[PDB]
Amino acid sequence: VDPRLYFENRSKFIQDQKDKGINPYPHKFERTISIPEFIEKYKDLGNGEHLEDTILNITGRIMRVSASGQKLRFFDLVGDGEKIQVLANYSFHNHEKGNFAECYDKIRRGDIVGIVGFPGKSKKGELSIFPKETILLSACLHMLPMKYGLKDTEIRYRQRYLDLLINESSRHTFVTRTKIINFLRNFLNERGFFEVETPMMNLIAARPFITHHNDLDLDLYLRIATELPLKMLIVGGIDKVYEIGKVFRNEGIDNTHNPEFTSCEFYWAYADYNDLIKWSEDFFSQLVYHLFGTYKISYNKDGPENQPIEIDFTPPYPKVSIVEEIEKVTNTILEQPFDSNETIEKMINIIKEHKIELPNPPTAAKLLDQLASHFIENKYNDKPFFIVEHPQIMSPLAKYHRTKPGLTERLEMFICGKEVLNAYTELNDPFKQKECFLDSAFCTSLEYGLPPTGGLGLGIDRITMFLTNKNSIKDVILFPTMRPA
Amino acid sequence: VDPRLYFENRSKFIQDQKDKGINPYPHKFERTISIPEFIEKYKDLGNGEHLEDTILNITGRIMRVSAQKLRFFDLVGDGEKIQVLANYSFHNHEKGNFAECYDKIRRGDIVGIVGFPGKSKKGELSIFPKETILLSACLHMLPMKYGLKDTEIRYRQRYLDLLINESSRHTFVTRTKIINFLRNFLNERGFFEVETPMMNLIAGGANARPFITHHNDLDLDLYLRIATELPLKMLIVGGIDKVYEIGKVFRNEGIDNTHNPEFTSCEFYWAYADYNDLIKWSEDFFSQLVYHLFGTYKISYNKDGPENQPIEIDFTPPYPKVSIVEEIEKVTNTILEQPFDSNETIEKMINIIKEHKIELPNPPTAAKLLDQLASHFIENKYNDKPFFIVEHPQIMSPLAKYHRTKPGLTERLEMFICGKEVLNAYTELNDPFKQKECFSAFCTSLEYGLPPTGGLGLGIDRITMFLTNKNSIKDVILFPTMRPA
Ligand SMILES: O=C(NCC1(O)CCC(F)(F)CC1)c1cc(=O)c2cc(F)ccc2o1
Ligand SMILES: O=C(NCC1(O)CCC(F)(F)CC1)c1cc(=O)c2cc(F)ccc2o1
């Protein structure tokens, strides 16, 4: 091919057109209808039917060019993810506005054009615009990749625009993401929740990103969660409150982790465990039904080259008590307290015998996390499920379980072995909140009285992955965090 | 009453309750109605009328303790208020001693009441308890009725502002309604909401130092975005023809009453739109937003603070359009000959600034001089209606398409409310051969073909300030970043 030459020559064309008094980047073309609107309005035409008296102005990007016949030229025109044909017939051209062949020979794949013409269908039944006049609105100076010729993630994740133009499923993925967020926002708002914005950077502060604030001469931390200020709003009497926005984790990158991701966190005064579980079941089932018209979906867990599985979002979903289950499968009691030297040693021994990676550092909470990932988190690939009743030492903001000492009223929901949701009743007794005696501001706010409250957070990117059949978070974030090329 | 001793005694109370087998922070109280729903259901009851057969569970925060045999409180929830009338006559004596129960209650305590609806003889809608449970105690003395004018406290303990100042909750409810109105306005027009990166590889801009941070695993310096403009334009190239984002942008600069280093913007791009379409979108949005909130286009604003008379701002469209160079030349009795960056015109501008005893921008570039002249001579032109400043010079507007009829100018508009910029918009300069930056990821995307496009940005915080009658931007941000205590 030689793309460099293609580009040099198209740049010369631009200059050339300008020499003839043609602006290949003109100011304004007044369109009368969009491509989706045109398809909706004309899709019932009969084969070969022309509405020669209906004159429309339309725009779009040319994505295919062909001819045979100097006097009959055909293009694909795309707009808003939809497509029509352009049938340029010598006889329908306005010859006073220019030479036909000259007008149409200069069009290349990628060009954005403005068409004045009439609607009809080809004898084959393809919905088409029949131009009297076609003008360039903006040129494509590069050779675009061919359809099915853009697989390189280095280009798709950086030059996302090329991915959107060439890979049809890419636009669908990002459409689905926005419909998920719209669904959630509406779901919450119909339940009386009040959306807010809290600060993206905090004084005191998951390993954080740090940034210097010039006006205050302070080094501040990007938020890792929106939890603290939301709870302060509950204290303030906003009894159902939430935020949907970005949080930042200066950690690793992989198929389920990006350094900024979008969370939805809500707090719900006077709610319990049971309300959070029901919320979760209601929300997931109703979202999937909204998107798909069924509770069951297909997901390629092990990639596009292997057979998919079915994930069923029909509620209710299984609940697995983390400690009881670890103890059962390992036939070992993890005696409380879980951070005793003896119980730590026991967890390390189990980890050592199953050749599970020892975490670093090997703290009781991280040991319990590793045990759960090994023995439980992959238990159910065919339905979402909750891991519940986590130890206090894993869950310092969660209220004590009312009948299982040492545990909490916490739930964490997993889809195919990946965490997408964490929720719990908030520990609201300041004399039991060990992290006070945590941002000193939080501690203080508890002393003014936090009602009994339930809190919940969702990972919007991971949810989108499952509902768009993607195996990497990079495929559901328009511009994922990447080093320069 | 001494605040330290008050707190110490409430802490001692908590522990004494626990020592008597009472949990002053119980897990769950199951409420059956909210305070707003209660007011709505029972507001028509005849005086002194009781529905003693309707047993309800209600919760709220006690905000007044009036009150033997008969105890009176104010109970608040969701920004509304009812009376509590606790009568010995109706108390469930099985559950506890009437005076022991009600003697323990203090202003700010959150409580759960089992009781019945009625009005008092005197006419006051009330809940009548049979039983009252502490759900979460206020350990501190709450500031009273007024007496929380202190901005430090309102901004550092926003929860106290929200509990004590009725107008606080209103300000922030209004803010959420503005954003909701905007999202819906856009969505009904076919715009598609996206999230672009908070962290990018662009080291700020000409008038905006960046927040800098660093991802440790990548070993990569990153910068907080100063605007969403670049990725949104790339999505226009990618065929998302009407695209927007509402979220935070970051400029690591000084703080004042109209500038916060983190602030909320909405930016949209609209392919195939012009100048005039952006003017009209602006008049439609502002007028309809104000009508939506107030039921009139005319609002009152204390431009000179609460201690001075307000002015009326009329949002009835259309709004005035003032051409920047023409108006400077008129008010200043000068002619500013192009090019505006000639030593002569620079000299003329510098001398106007000196002679008027206006601070001279440093360095004195043509764009900065023009900026200073507009700010002094034109940005206060109208205070009784919003207005547009239009047709900025190319030299001040390097991403704006050239004006079709006036040499050296652009298709740009900025809207001002009481001398403050709330919107900036223009037709995008899309010929890469005319974009001065293209001697970049921008310039590469322009080479693939950006259609003729209109772009617009709104300052959400400043718009909220005017629609909530605030003079400082910290008044419309829940938790603004403050110099630590
Ligand atoms: O969705 C995710 N996690 C699930 C949640 O923990 C998310 C927060 C919650 F919504 F509150 C509860 C459920 C997630 C996505 C990432 O890209 C990511 C990146 C990191 F560097 C570190 C953690 C990360 O976590
Ligand atoms: O609302 C503001 N400006 C108006 C806009 O320029 C906002 C960006 C646009 F929306 F795209 C077009 C209109 C504003 C608010 C601040 O708090 C602020 C702080 C700074 F450090 C620097 C500039 C700032 O500007």
What percent of the residues of chain A sit in helical stretches (DSSP H or I)? 25-40%
Shape of chain A: elongated
> Strand-residue fraction of chain A?
15-25%
Q: How many alpha or pi helices of chain A? A: 13
- CATH hierarchy: architecture of the largest domain in chain A: 2-Layer Sandwich
CATH topology of the largest domain in chain A, what is it called?
A: BirA Bifunctional Protein, domain 2
Termini of chain A, distance in Å? 23 Å
Bound heterogens, unique: ligand FYB
State the oligomer: homodimer
CATH homology-level superfamily of the largest domain in chain A: Bira Bifunctional Protein, Domain 2
Text of the CATH class of the largest domain in chain A:
Alpha Beta
Largest sheet of chain A: 8 strands, mixed
How many runs of DSSP E, i.e. beta strands of chain A? 18
Largest interface by residue count?
Answer: A-B, 108 and 108 residues
In what order do the strands lie side by side in the largest sheet of chain A?
A: 6-10-11-18-17-16-15-14
Number of domains of chain A: 2
Pfam family, one (chain A): tRNA-synt_2
GO molecular function (chain A): ATP binding; lysine-tRNA ligase activity; tRNA binding
Disulfide bonds (chain A): 436-443
Catalytic activity (chain A): tRNA(Lys) + L-lysine + ATP = L-lysyl-tRNA(Lys) + AMP + diphosphate
